[PDB]
Amino acid sequence: NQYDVIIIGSGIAGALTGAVLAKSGLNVLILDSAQHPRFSVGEAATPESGFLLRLLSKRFDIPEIAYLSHPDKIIQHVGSSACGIKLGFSFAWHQENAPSSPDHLVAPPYKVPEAHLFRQDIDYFALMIALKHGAESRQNIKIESISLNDDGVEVALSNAAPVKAAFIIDAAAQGSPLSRQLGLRTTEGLATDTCSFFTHMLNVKSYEDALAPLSRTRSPIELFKSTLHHIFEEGWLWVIPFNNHPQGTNQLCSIGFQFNNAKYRPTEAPEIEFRKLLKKYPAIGEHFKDAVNAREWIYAPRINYRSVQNVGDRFCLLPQATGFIDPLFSRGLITTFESILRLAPKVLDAARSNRWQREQFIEVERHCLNAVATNDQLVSCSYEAFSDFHLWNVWHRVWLSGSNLGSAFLQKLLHDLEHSGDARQFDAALEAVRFPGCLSLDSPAYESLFRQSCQVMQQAREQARPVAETANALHELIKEHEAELLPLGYSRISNRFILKV
Ligand SMILES: Cc1cc2nc3c(=O)[nH]c(=O)nc-3n(C[C@H](O)[C@H](O)[C@H](O)COP(=O)(O)OP(=O)(O)OC[C@H]3O[C@@H](n4cnc5c(N)ncnc54)[C@H](O)[C@@H]3O)c2cc1C
Ligand SMILES: [Br-]
Ligand SMILES: [Br-]
Ligand SMILES: [Br-]
Ligand SMILES: [Br-]
Ligand SMILES: [Ca+2]
Ligand SMILES: [Cl-]
């Protein structure tokens, strides 16, 4: 074998995987059919994704990875155009044929800033990390075939000799060639059925200028300095600025709109569907009076999928290649970074003992498949909560409380790793969590709240129950589990801006 590991895809997933494996002493080859620089979706970081990047950095002693968790460090070390700022999530609710109210808002602020990742710059920088640690990169390639044998993997290339390795990691997202050839991917069983239109734009007005200033909203954060979700019965639209950081130079704003295909199927070109949306929701339209498109729209008719398996003797599919649900709540980067964190030590142990069996990587699969199933429940129930603001307001606390517990758990793991300096103990601690792929990771009390709340939302959809009844039932569930959650006052529904500590 020419190499130890072949990685397909040189996006952030493949690049970071390549970096940690090469740093740890594997001969790595990264293959990509495109070349940098190149646009990619997946821009909103979360408290979880930030901690997971710092864990990867700390676990494998690669300081440059930790830079990617902080907007100031990205500006300083990647480049001033490589991110915008994110001080929280924000949700603004709307209804067709009614004026939009700036009191139909929720926006819980973070403790520390996070990033809106300008992926063309972040992903190239990440590949440079891998290249500096000795990973080889071959761009603009064409994979002819991937053979999986009992003594290794063989990848045939157009106009080049075959390459051989002990293991292949598919980090190629929706274009996973390993997923196509293995027949792993399916949409059977998925509660979520959504499409997406997305692009980058110039001259997108801030929420504050376009709709309502801070003095009106009473938000503790500018919605301009947040991942802003405009939600409504049949779908939602994101406003993710890169031009909201005072030290930043990026002029663009990322815009994407998603529809629940059960409620509305688009019939026309992206720009026409966009205009129809702004007519339906004029308040959303106030962002876009002077705005112009800085790339072509991308349309994806169905963004949701899962897999029945994602590891074998000689392969692993990373999360995007395995499964995706929706941009809502930004679980994609979380699932990805944690999967790398779990996979990489196991691949190192496999390469060091020369043992390559499916059972060695079973916990990577367990985490990934569980994460997609959790995210499917989370998102499908959220799309049902879009029908009414008061319902959304109560429902968002189910997600928030879970995410807050998950982030606290990852912070504690990082804290313990930094103090003990013990890598094996961290790996075991991550694997020992009682609910891998779930929002809290390890809280049985929370996962009871989550499961019961999701059952309430599905029953509400199935039986067309009134929204006031559904909201009240969720309120009582939150109250019932309060003591077991973090002491943030989640049951205080009148407080729409839940603060930390
Ligand atoms: C519309 C949309 C919005 C999203 N929004 C968010 C968000 O706000 N927050 C969040 O956390 N996550 C989001 N996600 C999920 C997020 O996109 C992923 O978690 C993340 O981009 C994964 O990065 P990656 O490096 O695995 O894949 P990518 O960044 O897509 O890179 C994959 C690479 O593989 C290459 N490739 C593809 N096919 C082949 C082939 N056959 N052979 C060789 N190479 C190939 C490509 O050229 C590309 O460079 C979103 C997803 C979608 C679809
Ligand atoms: Br740092
Ligand atoms: Br309310
Ligand atoms: Br209530
Ligand atoms: Br209240
Ligand atoms: Ca070797
Ligand atoms: Cl996502």
Author numbering: 2 to 502
What do the study authors state?
A bacterial halogenase PltM was originally identified as one of three putative halogenases encoded in the biosynthetic gene cluster of pyoluteorin, an antifungal compound containing a dichloropyrrole moiety. Recently, PltM was elegantly demonstrated to catalyze mono- and dichlorination of phloroglucinol, yielding, instead of a biosynthetic intermediate, a compound that serves as a potent transcriptional regulator of the pyolyteorin biosynthesis, whereas another halogenase, PltA, which acted on a peptidyl carrier protein loaded pyrrole, was shown to generate dichloropyrrole. Herein, we report the wide substrate profile and the unusually large halide versatility of PltM and its crystal structures that reveal a unique recycling mechanism of FAD. In addition to its remarkable halide versatility and a very broad substrate profile for a phenolic halogenase, PltM is at most ~15% identical in sequence to other structurally characterized FAD-dependent halogenases, and it contains a unique C-terminal region (residues 390–502).
We also validated the substrate binding cavity observed in the crystal structures by testing halogenation by two point mutants of PltM, L111Y and S404Y, in this setting. These two residues (one from the FAD binding fold and one from the C-terminal region) line the substrate binding cavity, and their bulkier substitutions are predicted to block binding of 1. For the cells expressing L111Y and S404Y mutants, the product yield was significantly reduced compared to wild-type; the effect of the S404Y mutation was especially severe. We determined a crystal structure of PltM L111Y, which showed that the overall protein structure is unperturbed and the only effect of the mutation was to obstruct the access to the substrate binding pocket, as predicted. S404Y caused a more drastic effect than L111Y because Y404 was predicted to sterically clash with the bound substrate. These data further validated the structure-based definitions of the substrate binding site and suggested a potential for halogenation in a fermentation setting.
